[PDB]
Amino acid sequence: ELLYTRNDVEEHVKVATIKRLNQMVIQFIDLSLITKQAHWNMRGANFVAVHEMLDGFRTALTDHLDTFAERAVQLGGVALGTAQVINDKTPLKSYPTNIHSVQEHLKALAERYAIVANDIRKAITEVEDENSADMFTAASRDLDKFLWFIESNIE
Amino acid sequence: ELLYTRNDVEEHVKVATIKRLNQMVIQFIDLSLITKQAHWNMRGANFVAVHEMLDGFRTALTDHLDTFAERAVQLGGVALGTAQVINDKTPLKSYPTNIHSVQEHLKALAERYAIVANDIRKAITEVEDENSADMFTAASRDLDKFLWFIESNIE
Amino acid sequence: LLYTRNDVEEHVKVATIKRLNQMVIQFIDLSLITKQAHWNMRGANFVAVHEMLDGFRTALTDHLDTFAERAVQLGGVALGTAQVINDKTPLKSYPTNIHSVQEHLKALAERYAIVANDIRKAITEVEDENSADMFTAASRDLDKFLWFIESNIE
Amino acid sequence: ELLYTRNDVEEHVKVATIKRLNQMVIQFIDLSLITKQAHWNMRGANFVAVHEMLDGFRTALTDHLDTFAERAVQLGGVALGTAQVINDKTPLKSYPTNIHSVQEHLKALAERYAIVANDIRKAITEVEDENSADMFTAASRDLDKFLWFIESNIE
Amino acid sequence: PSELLYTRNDVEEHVKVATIKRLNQMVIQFIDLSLITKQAHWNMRGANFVAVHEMLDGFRTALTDHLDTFAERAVQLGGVALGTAQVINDKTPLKSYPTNIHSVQEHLKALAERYAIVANDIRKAITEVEDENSADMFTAASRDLDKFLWFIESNIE
Amino acid sequence: ELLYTRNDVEEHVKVATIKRLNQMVIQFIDLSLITKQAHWNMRGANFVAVHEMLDGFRTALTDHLDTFAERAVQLGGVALGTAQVINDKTPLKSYPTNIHSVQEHLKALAERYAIVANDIRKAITEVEDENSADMFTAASRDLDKFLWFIESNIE
Amino acid sequence: ELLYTRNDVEEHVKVATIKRLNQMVIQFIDLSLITKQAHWNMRGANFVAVHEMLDGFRTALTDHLDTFAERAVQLGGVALGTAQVINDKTPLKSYPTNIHSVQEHLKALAERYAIVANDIRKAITEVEDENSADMFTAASRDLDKFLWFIESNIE
Amino acid sequence: LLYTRNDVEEHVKVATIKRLNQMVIQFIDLSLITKQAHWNMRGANFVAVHEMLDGFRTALTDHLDTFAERAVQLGGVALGTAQVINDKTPLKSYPTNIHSVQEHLKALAERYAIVANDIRKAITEVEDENSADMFTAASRDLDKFLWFIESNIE
Amino acid sequence: ELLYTRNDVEEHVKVATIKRLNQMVIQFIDLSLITKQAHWNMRGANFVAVHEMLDGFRTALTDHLDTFAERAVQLGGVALGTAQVINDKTPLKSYPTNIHSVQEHLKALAERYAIVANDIRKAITEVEDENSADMFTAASRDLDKFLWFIESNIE
Amino acid sequence: ELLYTRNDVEEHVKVATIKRLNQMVIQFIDLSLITKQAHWNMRGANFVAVHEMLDGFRTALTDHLDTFAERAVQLGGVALGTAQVINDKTPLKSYPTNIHSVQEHLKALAERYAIVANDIRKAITEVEDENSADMFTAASRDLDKFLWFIESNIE
Amino acid sequence: LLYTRNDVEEHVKVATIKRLNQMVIQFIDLSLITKQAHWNMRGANFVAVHEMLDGFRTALTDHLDTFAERAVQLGGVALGTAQVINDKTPLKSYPTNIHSVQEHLKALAERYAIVANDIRKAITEVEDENSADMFTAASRDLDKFLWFIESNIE
Amino acid sequence: SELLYTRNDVEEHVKVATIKRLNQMVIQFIDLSLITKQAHWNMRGANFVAVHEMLDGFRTALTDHLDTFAERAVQLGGVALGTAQVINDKTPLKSYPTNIHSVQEHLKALAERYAIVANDIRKAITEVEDENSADMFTAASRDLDKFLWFIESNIE
Ligand SMILES: [Zn+2]
Ligand SMILES: [Zn+2]
Ligand SMILES: [Zn+2]
Ligand SMILES: [Zn+2]
Ligand SMILES: [Zn+2]
Ligand SMILES: [Zn+2]
Ligand SMILES: [Zn+2]
Ligand SMILES: [Zn+2]
Ligand SMILES: [Zn+2]
Ligand SMILES: [Zn+2]
Ligand SMILES: [Zn+2]
Ligand SMILES: [Zn+2]
C-alpha cells in the first residue's frame, strides 16, 4: 500500500508512477557509480578534459535522480537506492573492470548512457503524472546532451 | 598486478594499500547510498533538519571515497565502485527498505556508520602508506562527527 | 483585452487569464498564510520549521509573479489586491489562536494541499502551452512543500 | 492574552506596542500587494526602470514587516497578517484595477505610500518600546526614500 | 538516404529529420533577433535610453542561450546546426532591420514587429514538433520571448 | 585616568558610559562562552537545528560585544574581557556542566539570556551617550529575538 | 520655498533640518577630499596600511554623505555638494600640502576629523527630524571610529 | 554625422567610424563562425576545444560591442545586421559539411588569422587613440585565440 | 624640486606630466561632485534609471582620478585634490543650483562632461609619459562613453 | 562516567584523550580572550595592521577550539568552556590591563601564545588518538605561524 | 638560528630547516618548469593540458610558501633566489628545444616524480610533526599531479 | 628564421627582435618574483605584517604580467625561457642577500632591484615595434612603477 498524503493524484496513477520513477532512480544511481568508475580508471589521450567532464556528469545525474526519489515519496511510495536493490534490479550491464584506455571507457559509457537515455525519453510520454513528465523531460535533455558529449569524444 | 608509474612506493606496500583503500571505497559508497535512502524515506519529528543534514554528510562521503579511489589509482591499482562490487563485497547489512520514522532511520544509520568509522580508525594505524593514512584520518574525523551528529539526534 | 502582437487567440487569451488570476489569488493567500504560521508558532522543532517556511514564501512569491505576468502578457489584468484576495480566495480563513508547531503544520497542510491539488488539474485544463508549463513548475514545488509539511507532522 | 516570556517589558507597554506593531504590519503587507499590483499592470514611458524599481521596494517592505511581526510575537503578542485581517483593517484606500499608464500607477502609489510613510514617522514618537522605535525609524527611512523615488518619477 | 550522423540515440529517423529542420529555423530567427537587438541597442537615442539600452543587453544573453540550446539539440539528433552569416541572410523570415532610425520609440516599434514574428513562430513550433525534448526547449524560449515582447511593447509610449 | 583623545564627550559622561559598556562587554563575553558550552554538550530531540542556531547566536554576540568594547576605548577607557575579569565580575549564574538534553540546555540558556537581555534594554535609556544608546539598541534587538528563538524551541 | 512633497513633516522642522543636513553634507565632502589628499601624498613608516586604511574611510564617508543629501531633498530641499559651496561654506581649515610623513598626515587628519566628529555628535540631539537623528548617529559612530583609528597610529 | 559635444575632428570621425564598422563586421562573423564550429565538431580533443571556443565567443562580443559603441560616440551608425555582414565580410563562407575538430580547427585558423592580421594593422592606421586602444586589446585577444587554435592542431 | 625616487623617468618629463596629471585630477574631482549634485537634485521623466546611472559614472570617475594622483606621486610630485584648489583651478563652469528637471541637469552635465572629455582626449597625445598616456586613454574611453550616455537621454 | 557512543575507541584512551582535549580547549579560549583584549587597548606604531591581524588569529583560534571540543564530546565526554572554568584551570598568567602600546601588547601576547604553542606541539606525540593528533597538528601549525607573526612585529 | 620562543630542540630545528629549504629548492624549480612547458607546448590535447599546468603551479606555489615560513619559524632563513635554485636543485635542467605535448608531458613526469618521491621519504625523515603533516599534504598533491601528467601520455 | 610556424603575419625581423625583448623582460620579472618572496619570508621588525602581505600582492601581479610576455614570445613563434638556469645565467639583477632580516633592510634591497627592472621596461615600451608588446609592457610598467612607489614609501 501507500503512505497517506493530502496529495490527490489518482491511486492507480500513483502506483504506476512510483513504479517507473523507481526504475528510473535505479538506472540513474548505476549511471552515477559507473561514471565515477570510468572517471578513476581512465588513462591515455584526452585524459584530463574527459576526466573533468565526467565529474560534471556525476553531479547532474545525482540531482536528477534525487528529484525522482522525492517525487516517488510525494505520491506515497518508497524510493529505492541501496546497493542490493541496484545490483538486483539494474537493466544495465555491469561496468568492465579490465579496460584502461580513455576510448575504451568512452565506448563503455556511451553504451550504458544510451540505454538509460533511450529508456527515459520513452518514459516521458508513457507516464500519467505531468510532474514526472516534466521531471523526465529535464533529465532526458541532459542524458541526451551527455550522450552527445561522450560519443563526440570517440575518435 | 600493477600499471606502470614513476611513483616509487614499494611493490609490496602498493598492493596491500590498494586493497585497504578499495574496501574503504566500497564502504563509503554504501553509506553514501544508504544516506540518501534514509534521506528520501524519512518522516516525523525533526524531519527537515535531519533530511538536510544527510545531504551534507553525503557530499563529504562522496568527496572522501573519491580521494580513496584516486590514491589506489596513483598506486597503480584499479579503483572499484560499481553496484555489483559493493553488493558483493559490502561489510554492511542491507538497509531496511520499509522503515519510516526519522528515529527509525537515525538508528539504522548509526549502526552502519559506526561500523565504518570504527574500521577506518583502525585502518589508520595499520596502513603503511603515509598518504592513504592521512586521507583516512581526515575521513575518520568526518565520520566520527557524523556518527555523533546522528546519535545526538536520537530521542 | 489590451493590445499585443502576441497572437494567441482571443477565447484562449480570455479563458487562460482567468485561470492565471485565479491561481495568482491562491498563492498570494498561500503566501500570506505561510508567513502568518511563521511568526506565531512555538514548541518542538521551532527554528527549523520556521526557517523552512521562509524558503517556501520566496518560492511562492516568484511562482505567482510568473502567473501574473503571463496574464498581463496575454492582455488582461493581474489581480493581487488584499480586497480581491479576501473575497475570491477559496481557502478557509487562517486560524489566529493556534500557537504550537504541529497545529500550524496541520493548518498549513490542509491549505497547501488544496492549492496543490488544484494547480495539478490546471496544468491539464488550460490550452495556453506556456501556462501549462508555469503551472507544472509551480505544482512541482507545491507538491514538494506539501510533502515537506506533512513530513514534519508527528 | 499575552503569552509568557522571560522578557520583562511592562505588561501595559507590551499590549500597547503590539497593537502599533500590528497596524504597521497591516499596511506594509498592504503596500506589498499594492506594489506588485502596480508593477504587473503598468505600461508606457519609463516602464522598465519603474517595474524593477518596484521589485526593489517589494523586498524592502517585506523585510521590515517581518521585523514588526517578530517584535510583536516577541513581546508575547500575536502577529496578524491574513488576507482577511488586512482587507478588514487596512487604512489604505483600495487600489484601482482600471489603470495602466506608468504615470497613473505612480500617482496612485504615491498617495498610498504617503499615508504609510506619515503614519510610521509619527509612530516613532508614540511607541514606548525602544526596539520598536528603532524598527520604525529604520523602516521610516526606507519609506521616505521610496516615496521620494516614486514622486521624483512623476512627470 | 540518411544524411544523419550516427548516434546511439533512438529518436525515430523521420522525427529526427523534421525536428532538425525545425530546430535550425528557430536557430536562424534567434541569431537574427540577436543581431538586431544589439543593432537597436547601439543606435538608439532620446527619452528612456539607458533603461532600454540596458534592457536589450539582457535579452541578448537569453536569446544567445536559447539559440545555443536549439542548435545543440539538432546536433544530438544527428543533424548539422546552421548559423553562419550567409545562411541567416537568405534564411531569416525577418525583414531587414532599419538602419536609418534613431529614436528609442522607433527602435521599440521595429524591435516589436520582429520579436512578435519570432514570438509567434516558436509558440506554434511547440505543438508541431514530435520530439518532447524540443517542445520543452521551445516553451522555455517561448516564455522568455513572450516576456520580452511584453517588455518592449510596454516601453512604447 | 582616561586616555587623551580629541573626541569631546564630557569627562563625566565618558567615565559612566565606559563603566556601563564594560559591564555589557563582560556579560556578552560570558553569554557566548555559555552559548558554545551548550552547543557542544546538548543531545536529544531537535539537536542539529538547535546546534546550528546557537552558532549563529555566537557570531552576533561577538560583533556586538566587539562594538561595545571599541566604544569604551573610543571614549578613552580600557575594555575588559579577560577570563579573570568575567569570572570576578559576571552577574550570571555559573553555567551547569552536568546537563545534557537539548531541553535542559535551552532552559539554562533562557535564564541567562533573559537576564542580559532585560539588562541591556534598561541600559538603552540609562546611557547618556547617543552612540552607546545606538549600539545597545542594535544589540538588544538581537538578544530579544534570540531569547525568543530559545524559548520557542522549549517544549 | 520648498518643493512639493506628500512627505508631511512640519515645514519649519523641514527648513531647519535641511540646513543642518547641508552643513553635514558640506563637511563630509570636505573630509572625503582631505582623506584622499593624505592617502596620496603619504610616506614614511607604517605607509601601506595607513594608506589602505584611508580608502576604507572614504567609502564610508561618501556613503553617509549620500544619505544626508537624499534626506535634505526628501524634505523639499536642495542638496549642496558643489566645489564652490565646499570652498565657501566649510568650517575646516584647508589641508596642508607641504607635509609628507605619515605622522604629519595623521595629525592633519586628526584635527580635522575631530572638528567634524565632535560636531555631528552634538547635531544628533540638536535636530528635530527623527530619521536625520538616526543618520547622524550611524555616521557619528563611524566618524568616532575613524578618529580613534587615526589617533591610534600616532606615535 | 549626429551631433555630439565630442570634438573629434570631422574627417577623423568619418574615417574612424568606417574602420570601426569593418571590425564590427568581422568580429561578428568571427563569432558566428566560432559557434558554428562549436556545435559541429566531433573527434579527438572535443570537450576541451568545444568549451575553449565558448570563451572566444564571449571575448569576441564584448570587443565588437566596444567598437560599435565607439562608432556611435563619434556620430556614426554601428552596423551589425545579418545582411550587412553577409555583403561586406572578407572571410570565406564557412563550410557546413565538415565534422572533425582537426578540420574545424583548420577552418577557424584561416579566418581567425585573417581578422587578426587585419586589426593589428588597424592599430596604427587609425588616428583616434581610443579606437587604437580598443583595437590593441582585441588584437591581443585575437592573437592569443589564434595561438590556442593553431596549438590544438595535431 | 621633486621628492626623491629611483624611478628614473627624465626630470623635465616628471614636472611636465605632474602638472598635467594634477590638471586631470582637478577636473575629474569637479566632475565627481557635479555628478553627485545632479544625482541628488533631479526630478522628472526617466529619473530612477538616470539617477542610478549617475552613481556608476562616479565610481568610474573616482577610480581614474585615483590613478592620476598616484602617477603624479610616483614621479615625485604632490597630488592636489582639496576643495580649495578645485574651487581655484577648475576650468569647469560653476554648476547651477536651481535647476530641477532631469533634462535641465542632463544638459548642464553634458556641457561639462564634454569639456573634460575633449580635454583629456587631447592630453593623451600631449604628455610624454607613456604610462600616464595609457592612464588618460582609459579615462578617455569612459568619459566619451559617459558623455554619450548623458547626451543620449536628452530628448 | 562517559556517555554512550558506538565509537569504539577504548575507554582508557577515550578518557586520557578527553582530559587532554579539554586543557587545550581551555587554553585556546583563553588565548581567544587575550587576543581580543590586546586588539582593543593597543596603540602606537603599526596599530591598524596589528589590530587587523589579531582579528584573524581570533577566528582561527576559535575554530580549532571547536574542533577540539566536539572530539571530546564524540568520545563520550563533556567539553568545558565556561568563564569559571577558564579562570580555575588556565595555566596562562592574567593578561595585563594597564599596558597600552602595540609593542607592549605584542610582548604579552608572545609569552602566552608561546606557552600554548609549545604545549600543544608536545601534545601531538603524547595523545593516543590519531584524530586528535591530527586535530592538534593543524592548530599547532597555526599557533606557530601566529607566534612568528607576533614576534616578527616586535622591534 | 634566529631567536624565537618556539622551543623545538636546537638540533631538530637545524636539521628540519635544512630539509625544508630542500623541499623549497626543488618546489620552486618545479613551478618554473611547470610554466616553461605550459607556455611552449603544442599538439594534440594542448588546451586542457595548458590549463591543467596552471592549476599545478598555484598548488606548488602555495606548498612551497608553507615550507618557507615553517623554516623561518624554527629560526632559520628561507632560500629561494635564482642563484640558490640553480646551485642547489637536484633536478636536471628542463629541455628548451622540445615542442610537442607528449615530449613535454614526459619531460615533466621525470622531474615531478623525482620531487614526488623525495618528499614522500621526507615525511618519515623529519623530526618535526608540523613538517611531516606539511610534507604530507604536499606529497598528496604531488602524487596526484604525477598521476595526472602520466595519465595523459598516449 | 628558426621561428615556429604560424599564420600570425607580423614582419619576421620584428618577431625575432620582439621575442628577444619579451624574453629579457620575462627573466627580470621571474627574478623579481623570486626575490619578492625571498624578502617576504625573511623580514622582521617594525611594520612587518603589512609589508609581508603587501609583497604577496606584488608576486601575484608580476606572475600574471610575466606570463603575458611569454605567451607573447610564443605567439610570434618564439620560445619563452623561464628556467632557473636561464634566470641565473642571463639575469641583470644582483644576487639578493640571504643574511639580511630587517624590514628596512629588505625594502632597500627590493627598492634597488624593482628600480632596475621598472626603469628598463619603461624604455622597452618605446623601443619595441609590435604594438601588442608595448600595450603589454605599458600595463606592467604601470604596476612596477606603482609597486616601486609602495616599496619606497615604506622606508623610514
Ligand atoms: Zn534531496
Ligand atoms: Zn575525482
Ligand atoms: Zn515581476
Ligand atoms: Zn521572519
Ligand atoms: Zn554551447
Ligand atoms: Zn574589533
Ligand atoms: Zn545617492
Ligand atoms: Zn553596449
Ligand atoms: Zn589609491
Ligand atoms: Zn561546532
Ligand atoms: Zn606566504
Ligand atoms: Zn598562462
UniProtKB/Swiss-Prot annotation, chain L:
Question: What is this enzyme's EC?
Answer: 1.16.-.-
Q: Which UniProt keywords apply?
A: Cytoplasm, DNA condensation, DNA-binding, Iron, Iron storage, Metal-binding, Oxidoreductase
Q: Which GO terms describe its molecular function?
A: DNA binding; ferric iron binding; oxidoreductase activity, acting on metal ions
Which InterPro entries does this UniProt record tie to the protein?
A: DPS_DNA-bd, DPS_DNA-bd_CS, Dps_gammaproteobac, Ferritin-like, Ferritin-like_SF, Ferritin_DPS_dom
Q: Name one GO biological process term.
A: intracellular iron ion homeostasis
Pfam families noted in UniProt: Ferritin
Q: Under which main EC class is this enzyme filed?
A: oxidoreductase
Signal peptide position in this chain?
A: none
Instruction: From the Swiss-Prot or TrEMBL record, give the protein name.
Output: DNA protection during starvation protein
User: Where is it chiefly localized?
Assistant: cytoplasm
Give the binding site residues for Fe cation. Answer: H40, D67, E71
Query: Chloroplast among the record's keywords?
Result: no
Top-level taxon of origin: Bacteria
Query: What does it catalyze?
Result: 2 Fe(2+) + H2O2 + 2 H(+) = 2 Fe(3+) + 2 H2O
Family, similarity comment: Belongs to the Dps family.
Q: Where in the cell is it found?
A: Cytoplasm
Q: How does it assemble?
A: Homododecamer. The 12 subunits form a hollow sphere into which the mineral iron core of up to 500 Fe(3+) can be deposited.
GO CC annotations on file: cytoplasm
Source gene? dps
